[PDB]
Amino acid sequence: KLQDSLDAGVGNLVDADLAKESAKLQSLQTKQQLGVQALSIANQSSSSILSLF
Amino acid sequence: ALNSINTNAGAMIALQNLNGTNSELTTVQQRINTGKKIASAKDNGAIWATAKNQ
């Protein structure tokens, strides 16, 4: 009985909640996809200078 | 003098308007990159400080 209590205590100390990690993973994947597109938008600046010359 | 060869104000004013458009574009791109309106202390000092402390 004591060993079961100690195992449960350590698990309570260091375990995670995967239900929350799923939501965080979804939001972060969407944000990374948006960040790549934002970098692509930022790269195409200064390309309009060539028309002046 | 409508025929001056040394200067023309049309180019100056076109340049000024182009620079204004570029500045607005920079602000919008920053909003898109960071995903938030108040990202730094330049955007809004009061709201940025409040959010940091909270």
What residues of chain A lie within 8 A of the CB of B28, using their CB? Answer: none
Are B33 and A38 in contact by the 8 Å Cβ rule? The answer is: yes
Distances (CA, A) of B27 to A32, A48, A49, B19, B35: 20, 19, 20, 13, 12
Q: Is B33 exposed, middle or buried (0-12, 13-18, 19+ CB in 10 A)?
A: middle
Tell me if A41 and B29 make a contact (CB, 8 A cut-off): yes
Residue of A nearest to B34 (CA): A35
Q: Alpha-carbon distance A2 to A9, whole Å?
A: 11
Q: What is the largest CA-CA distance in chain A?
A: 84
Two tokens, residue B35? 């995903």
Q: What is the CA radius of gyration of chain A?
A: 24
Q: Which residue from B27, B25, B32, B13 is spatially nearest to A48, judged by alpha carbons?
A: B25
Q: What residue type is A17 in one-letter code? A: D
Distance from CA of B46 to the nearest CA of A (A): 27
What residues of chain A lie within 8 A of the CB of B29, using their CB? Answer: 38, 41-42
Resolution of the experimental model, in Å, one decimal: 3.2
Q: Which residue from B29, B33, B9 is spatially nearest to B21, judged by alpha carbons?
A: B29
How was it solved? cryo-EM
Cβ atoms within 10 Å, residue B32: 14
- State the distance between the two ends of chain B, measured CA to CA, in whole angstroms: 61
Residue of B nearest to A43 (CA): B29
Buried b (16+ CB within 10 A) or exposed e, A3-22: eeeeeeeeeeeeeeeeeeee
Are B31 and B37 in contact by the 8 Å Cβ rule? The answer is: yes
Are B35 and A34 in contact by the 8 Å Cβ rule? The answer is: yes
Give the residue ranges of DSSP H helices in chain B. Answer: 9-34, 45-53
